[PDB]
Amino acid sequence: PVPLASRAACEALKDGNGDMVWPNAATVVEVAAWRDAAPATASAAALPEHCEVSGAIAKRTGIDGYPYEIKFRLRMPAEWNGRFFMEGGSGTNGSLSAATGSIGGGQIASALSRNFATIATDGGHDNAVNDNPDALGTVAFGLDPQARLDMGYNSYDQVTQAGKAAVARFYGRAADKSYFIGCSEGGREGMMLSQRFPSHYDGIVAGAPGYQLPKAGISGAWTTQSLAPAAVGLDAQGVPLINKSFSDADLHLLSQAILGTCDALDGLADGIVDNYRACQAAFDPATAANPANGQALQCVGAKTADCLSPVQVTAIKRAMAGPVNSAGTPLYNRWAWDAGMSGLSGTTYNQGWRSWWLGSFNSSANNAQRVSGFSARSWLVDFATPPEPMPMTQVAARMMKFDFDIDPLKIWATSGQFTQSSMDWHGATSTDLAAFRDRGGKMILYHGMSDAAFSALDTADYYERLGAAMPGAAGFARLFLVPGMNHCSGGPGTDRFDMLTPLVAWVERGEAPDQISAWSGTPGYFGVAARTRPLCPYPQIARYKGSGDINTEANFACAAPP
Ligand SMILES: [Ca+2]
């Protein structure tokens, strides 16, 4: 005689503590604990009294000899709004968060703080355990084929099913609606769900989605080899210091030149390139001027602090252009020029763009994500098939000798026990969302224009393919590009927003987001205390109404570009 949504019902969910039936028979509950309410903190909204359940699914040994399991953590509030929530991952996953239901966007509130039931997974591997010194550290899960499948799609499927079964037993009813919010790798997960598991979630937010993540290391090898002629000095292995190709002052000059060409193309000079399409048609660093001195951005002779050398201009132009093979066939996409490639807040230069292709300037070693960091490591072990484990010191050189006629094929290939390609299990490129749309599914995409991890133009290209394949796609899927914003957060733009509130309104009331309110997390980039702007559904952009404070969303409306 155990009442629903109670401490007794919570503790009954543990193995050997009752009658709970899990969808996957290999589910092990390690924790089923009643949690008191937690007060608000400086960085988190208050958490209601809830049941916390944590465990793992399909504990096994991989073909690499390492243990694998799909961890989950679920929190079911005693006072429940009838909604189910899953948060996405980041990086290459491998960690189990507090699972309070992050909504991204730099937000204080969690889904659990709004009385959702919330769940998270580690994706099928554990960074504390699946750490192989001969397979590039925590990307070493790529040595096991099933761990790849779990990372690609299976972990989120198993955890969604397990969460909904516990919700049904704990509350005595299924969730009215289910929601998923993820950014980066979590954005790829959201797109994967809409394509592969259309009925798992009714509302999906997919920010900066790496829906072509196996191509990232291809872009990384390209940007690495493109910036190398501008590098100064060598690291300990004799590899050119890609981080020395551009100083922070150099990048700020590039950004200021982008603003000189593109800032006013939306009708208002405000440090924000709202008209990104017009900017791409207008800006060329080989021709653009330095608006501070009126002279050309590219140096005429020797390098000064007010110009970029012709080698630098050639290098960044090639990097932004995107990778091509010998036939000239594009292998990923190009990248948009934007002011968030740099930015200055007080005396602090923005690192949020250069960390991906360049790395920190004040280092005698390469530390860019795409040169020697996690992204380059992940491609070699997780996305190349068969995997290419190596010592950590060899990664930068491996990117320098990357062959664009041979190596890109490895993301489409199968080998031995690796029976799916990395584009098979990790890719989420399908525009067949009819099952998702026709059951009432709604999807909000967002992407920062100054994202150096994944190209915002590549998300836009996906959205255009979606609208062509599905007439009237704006009725269930809308894309919100964020000028100036880096990867998932940061940069001179309005990078903070509450995506959960309009997602619920769209799914449950049919109210499509004609704009989404946003604010800047670092308004010092513009020298103000605060800046609020509307995000606009693609292809619309923000247009100043002609009067009022330029830092207040009320004085802007969404419209077609000028
Ligand atoms: Ca502007």
Numbering used by the authors: 42 to 603
Quote the paper.
A similar Ca2+ binding site was characterized for Aspergillus oryzae FaeB (AoFaeB), wherein it was hypothesized to have a role in stabilizing the lid domain. To examine the effect of calcium binding, a fifth scenario absent of either MHET or Ca2+ was modeled in triplicate 150-ns simulations (the prior four scenarios each include bound Ca2+). These trajectories show evidence for lid stabilization upon Ca2+ binding mainly in the immediate vicinity of the calcium binding site. In fact, the terminal residues of the lid domain converge to within hydrogen-bonding distance of each other (Tyr252-Ala469, 2.9 Å), creating a compact linkage to the hydrolase domain. The lid domain of MHETase is exceptionally large, as average lid domains in α/β-hydrolases tend to be ∼100 residues, and is more typical of a lid from tannase family members (vide infra). One of the MHETase disulfides is located at the active site, connecting cysteines (Cys224 and Cys529) adjacent to the catalytic residues (Ser225 and His528, respectively), which is conserved in tannase family members.
PETase cleaves BHET to MHET and EG, and the soluble MHET product is further hydrolyzed by MHETase to produce TPA and EG. Overall, the structure of MHETase is most similar to that of FAEs. The structural conservation between the hydrolase domains of MHETase and PETase is striking, and despite the large insertion of ∼240 residues representing the lid domain, residues Ser225, Asp492, and His528 effectively reconstitute the catalytic triad.
